[PDB]
Design a protein around this ligand. Sequence first.
Ligand SMILES: CCNC(=O)CCNC(=O)[C@H](O)C(C)(C)COP(=O)(O)OP(=O)(O)OC[C@H]1O[C@@H](n2cnc3c(N)ncnc32)[C@H](O)[C@@H]1OP(=O)(O)O
Ligand SMILES: [Mg+2]
Ligand SMILES: [Mg+2]
Lengths: 309, 393
Amino acid sequence: SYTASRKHLYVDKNTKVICQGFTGKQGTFHSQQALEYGTNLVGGTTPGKGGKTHLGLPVFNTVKEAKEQTGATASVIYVPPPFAAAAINEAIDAEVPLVVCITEGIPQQDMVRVKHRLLRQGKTRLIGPNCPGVINPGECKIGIMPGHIHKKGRIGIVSRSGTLTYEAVHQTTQVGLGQSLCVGIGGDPFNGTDFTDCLEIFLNDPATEGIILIGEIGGNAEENAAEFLKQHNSGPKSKPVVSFIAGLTAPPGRRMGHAGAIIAGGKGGAKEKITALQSAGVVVSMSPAQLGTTIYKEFEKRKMLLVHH
Amino acid sequence: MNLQEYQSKKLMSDNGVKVQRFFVADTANEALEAAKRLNAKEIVLKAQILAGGRGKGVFSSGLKGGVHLTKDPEVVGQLAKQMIGYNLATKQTPKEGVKVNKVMVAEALDISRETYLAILMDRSCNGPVLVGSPQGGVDIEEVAASNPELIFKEQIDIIEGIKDSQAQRMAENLGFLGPLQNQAADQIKKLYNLFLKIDATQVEVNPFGETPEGQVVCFDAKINFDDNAEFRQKDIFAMDDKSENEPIENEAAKYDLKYIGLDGNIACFVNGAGLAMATCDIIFLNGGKPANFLDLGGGVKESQVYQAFKLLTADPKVEAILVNIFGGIVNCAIIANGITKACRELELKVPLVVRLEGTNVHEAQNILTNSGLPITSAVDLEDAAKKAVASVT
Ligand SMILES: CCNC(=O)CCNC(=O)[C@H](O)C(C)(C)COP(=O)(O)OP(=O)(O)OC[C@H]1O[C@@H](n2cnc3c(N)ncnc32)[C@H](O)[C@@H]1OP(=O)(O)O
Ligand SMILES: [Mg+2]
Ligand SMILES: [Mg+2]
């Protein structure tokens, strides 16, 4: 099953990464930043530019050659919209364990076709597209999030919004909780990883003691996450979950920046999402500025901030 | 993007979908000739505007009603003379109305059965879905609320394509019978293939129905398009009719800016869709009314920052501007450069509240400082919203 690849979401200091679109503008810049962060960036692909070096690293014509020659276990895609679905499919065909697609603007129909192939295999896990990537603070950064605001810690964060991820990260670093693993699932309607996929990993990760789930209008992923949490996050070991759902003030029938953020035919409003998550035991913050303080207070009431003297 | 009725119906007709026979005319004489060419028993003349309420509208010529039926081609020409070049006002237009440059001259068909049929990519199942109801002629939301048992779905596998059995079952559940059911099943297949060909996000036919004479027809339809596929749908996007858009939204589109006008006076200028929605939300929570949504996009360039800021400052509804950037791929200095240059070239007549975080924030803040512009710096989202709301009457 495709769910077997959920484990590949949890990047760490031993993850080895190649860059598809390596010689492009953003591929170059974020590969340089990845090296400076300490990510094991080992090479990349641009079709037709194999046999060159770039940033002191090898460039390959194909994902298969790059993977075989470097032992890469993850790929990050900075390929323009007309070709990014093909880049994802090439990485699936090469059985790369984790593929992270940053690109915004892939045709929705392209992603429906990609997801059809993705769901019929279990070797490759896709995050994205239209996402900032994934980060294990101090261990591995694959994406475009600002490194300096993170702090290794206790909160797992999953979000349909990159910018709101940064808000939750900054808030949780400020109050000293830090982050165990942050996954941006992206703003597109059809993507490789949903909330439930990350919740499975967070609930079974001892390092993740609390969870922030950030959603927005459109689709049904938040409702599916609520159902997952009803079944799997009840009991004495239940972990605190705090959430913000953007778009209570959004008008209907309009895509609000993200391709997936629309109230369409009456479906996808924020109010129903907040209700579903509250019924699953999630504490929903009234304000997007109070994610960190809200989960802090949940920890406080559970005596999870006591000092060992 | 938006298509006029004649544009969507031509697109459907060119792909085998049955619509009423019609011609489009841009002069009264062309309307006359089109009406003769139809060789129809009854003719409908319809002014082409996007807003609803045409039937009860009024033209600046004095003519009442944007939809007229007649059996006489000369009457079509005469009434078209009182439509073309004039403004049509309706309940859904501004007081001035909308200029009518084209009319549709169509065969008027009676409706004996009305059903609802839409095709879209299912947000809960991977792949296309047919959504149908025998209860046609009303918003799908109404049917879902009153008679959810009358909503039927067929999940389609994108690789296998639509199967005859799926089309036939949906046609049966819509209530079509015998040969009309076979016609409707065939039309469902044509609609499905159209949906994929044009990168629609939705093809909605309502009413999808039949005439008393025994033909299945798509009497009216609304097509929504995937903006992400513009690069491979150039001909369709060239038909985009922007005449009824907010003019600021049209200016924003010229610079590939994702701007949505709202009813408020606090402008928002943000680098992410989620944060932009959240910024509107938190302005409201602190007692304000956002004037717009704006997601600059991760790939924003300085020129787009410049243009976006000018659009906000030029909008008479705006009484203050909230800039809120948490940069990752977006470098905060590009924001500072675009804003300061845009204000070097005009006076800043509204309060400016700025919250910057993330990539290269210190350089960006020094750019803002050394520009001399009057800025209220905010310490976080809540502070930014409170200061913005405090900056307006
Ligand atoms: C967080 C949400 N995401 C965002 O906000 C991202 C927004 N930006 C985008 O989506 C942009 O389209 C991207 C960042 C993906 C790309 O933009 P960028 O400015 O880097 O594009 P470029 O054209 O410079 O680089 C793309 C490179 O991919 C290469 N490429 C094309 N197809 C492929 C492929 N199948 N495999 C690998 N590389 C490929 C191109 O050849 C080009 O490299 P080159 O210029 O050396 O030939
Ligand atoms: Mg509707
Ligand atoms: Mg974005």
